[PDB]
Every structure is written in C-alpha cells, then in structure tokens.
Amino acid sequence: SVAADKLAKLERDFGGSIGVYAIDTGSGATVANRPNERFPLCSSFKGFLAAGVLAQSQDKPGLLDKRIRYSKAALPNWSPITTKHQASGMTVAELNAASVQYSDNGAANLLLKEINGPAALTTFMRSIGDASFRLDRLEPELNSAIPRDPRDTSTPKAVAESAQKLALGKALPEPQRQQLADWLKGNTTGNARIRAAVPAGWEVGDKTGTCGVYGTANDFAVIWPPKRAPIVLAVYTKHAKKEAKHSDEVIAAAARAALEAFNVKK
Numbered sequence: 001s002v003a004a005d006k007l008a009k010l011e012r013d014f015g016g017s018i019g020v021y022a023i024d025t026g027s028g029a030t031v032a033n034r035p036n037e038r039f040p041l042c043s044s045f046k047g048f049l050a051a052g053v054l055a056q057s058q059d060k061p062g063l064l065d066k067r068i069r070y071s072k073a074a075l076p077n078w079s080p081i082t083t084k085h086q087a088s089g090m091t092v093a094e095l096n097a098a099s100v101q102y103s104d105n106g107a108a109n110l111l112l113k114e115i116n117g118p119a120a121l122t123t124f125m126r127s128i129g130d131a132s133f134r135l136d137r138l139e140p141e142l143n144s145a146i147p148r149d150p151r152d153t154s155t156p157k158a159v160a161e162s163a164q165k166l167a168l169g170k171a172l173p174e175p176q177r178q179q180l181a182d183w184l185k186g187n188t189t190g191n192a193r194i195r196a197a198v199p200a201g202w203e204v205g206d207k208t209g210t211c212g213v214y215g216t217a218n219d220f221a222v223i224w225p226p227k228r229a230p231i232v233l234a235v236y237t238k239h240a241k242k243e244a245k246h247s248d249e250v251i252a253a254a255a256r257a258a259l260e261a262f263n264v265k266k
C-alpha cells in the first residue's frame with residue numbers, strides 16, 4: 001500500500017522497526033505494519049493501568065476518592081506531580097491524572113500497588129481478550145527495552161484493539177469509559193507524536209512511552225474528529241543498538257502515513 005511503502009521508508013532511515021496499527025471505526029479499515037511483533041510498552045502501559053484501576057472501581061465505589069499518602073523516599077525518579085503533593089497525599093483519581101497526563105512514575109507505581117501489581121494488570125488485560133499485553137516489572141526497571149526480551153511488551157495490534165475496547169467500546173461501564181477517555185484527552189506529553197499528525201483542534205486521547213534506550217518510544221491514541229467516526233492508532237518503535245535515539249518525528253511521520261490512508265490530513 002501507499003502507507004506500507006511510506007512506513008518501510010521511515011524504517012530504512014530510522015535504522016530500526018516501526019510497528020503501526022490503525023483502525024478507522026467508521027469504515028472498519030485498518031493500516032498495519034509489524035502488527036503482531038512485540039515492542040516495549042515503556043510508559044504507555046499507564047493508559048491501560050488507568051483502565052485496570054477503573055475496572056476495580058466497579059467493585060469498590062469511592063476508590064477514585066480514596067486518598068493515598070506516601071513517603072518522599074519511596075518515590076522513584078521522574079515523579080513531578082507526586083513529589084509536589086507528598087504533604088497532601090493524592091486521591092486515586094488524581095494519581096491517574098498524573099500517571100496518564102504527566103507520566104508520573106511514582107503515581108503509576110502507587111496505582112500498581114492499589115490494583116495488586118503488574119501480574120494483576122496483565123490479568124485484567126487478558127480478561128478483555130488481550131493475549132499480548134504483559135507487564136512484568138515496576139518503574140523504572142520496565143524500561144530496559146532489551147532487544148527480543150518479551151518482558152513489559154505488547155503488540156501494535158493489541159494496543160490499538162485494547163484502546164478501542166476500553167476507551168470507545170464496552171469493556172468498561174460507560175461512566176468509567178468516559179473517565180478513561182477524559183484522562184487520555186488531557187494528556188500533556190504527546191504534542192510531538194500522534195497529535196502532531198492530527199488536524200488542529202480535534203480531540204485526541206493518547207499515552208506516550210519513552211524507554212530512553214534502543215531507539216524505543218511510542219504513542220497510542222484515540223482521535224475523536226468533529227465530523228467523522230473515531231480513529232484508533234498505535235505507533236511503536238525499537239532499534240537494535242542501545243545508543244540509538246528514539247524520534248518524535250518518526251512517530252509523527254508514521255502517524256501521518258496511517259492517517260492519510262484514512263483520508264485524514266493535517
């Protein structure tokens with residue numbers, strides 16, 4: 001296809017692999033590249049963590065209102081929101097907002113503890129029919145991104161299909177789906193990635209990941225146009241060389257190629 005050819009050229013210049021899965025929920029059309037290959041999730045797992053916490057909240061009402069207090073010394077690196085609010089604590093809802101919208105690592109590890117760990121999140125994902133997602137480790141060790149290593153990975157197809165089920169479909173009850181959507185829509189970290197390829201002003205709920213090694217970074221998004229049906233897009237990169245840098249521009253370019261196949265151009 002046009003899109004496949006553009007994605008192949010992006011891979012050649014990048015020197016590594018670009019996994020793409022896009023779904024136009026209007027027509028059902030798809031764009032795929034390396035759809036079933038594993039890529040590290042990095043911070044992108046936090047969008048699915050939010051869905052797993054919301055799933056627990058159907059059981060335990062008031063869960064989003066529960067205030068979590070924590071020590072300063074227990075926070076991992078890259079915890080800007082949780083560090084700032086240590087004296088006040090944060091509610092489970094606030095922690096999800098920081099985890100999803102700022103990629104706060106301390107928030108993500110606190111919510112992992114709330115839902116009983118990476119295996120528990122993986123079980124929730126299996127319960128929606130996602131057989132690919134696996135979370136094995138906590139922040140920051142989950143970002144090692146070692147080539148061929150299956151820990152803390154998913155596939156582009158499974159990321160996009162699960163994002164569809166959770167943020168557009170019925171895997172969560174409607175109030176929880178709306179909350180997940182609203183958290184993703186207020187992300188602040190994705191402006192150079194999928195969003196860079198989306199027409200101005202359209203709502204985009206996305207979650208980025210940047211492992212910081214092996215050219216490994218990613219973004220997945222649900223795009224809500226004003227005039228046409230939602231589109232779901234997952235873009236994941238990896239590279240065989242430890243020192244290879246990830247590229248926002250490559251991710252944005254891959255998003256552009258997929259969206260052009262759906263006749264969406266910024």
Ligand SMILES: *C(=O)N1C[C@H](NOS(=O)(=O)O)CC[C@H]1C(N)=O
Binds near residue numbers: 042043078103104139
């Ligand atoms: C997620 O991959 N991480 C936490 C934070 N994420 O921000 S990003 O998703 O906008 O890149 C920083 C990078 C990374 C990490 N080092 O844990």
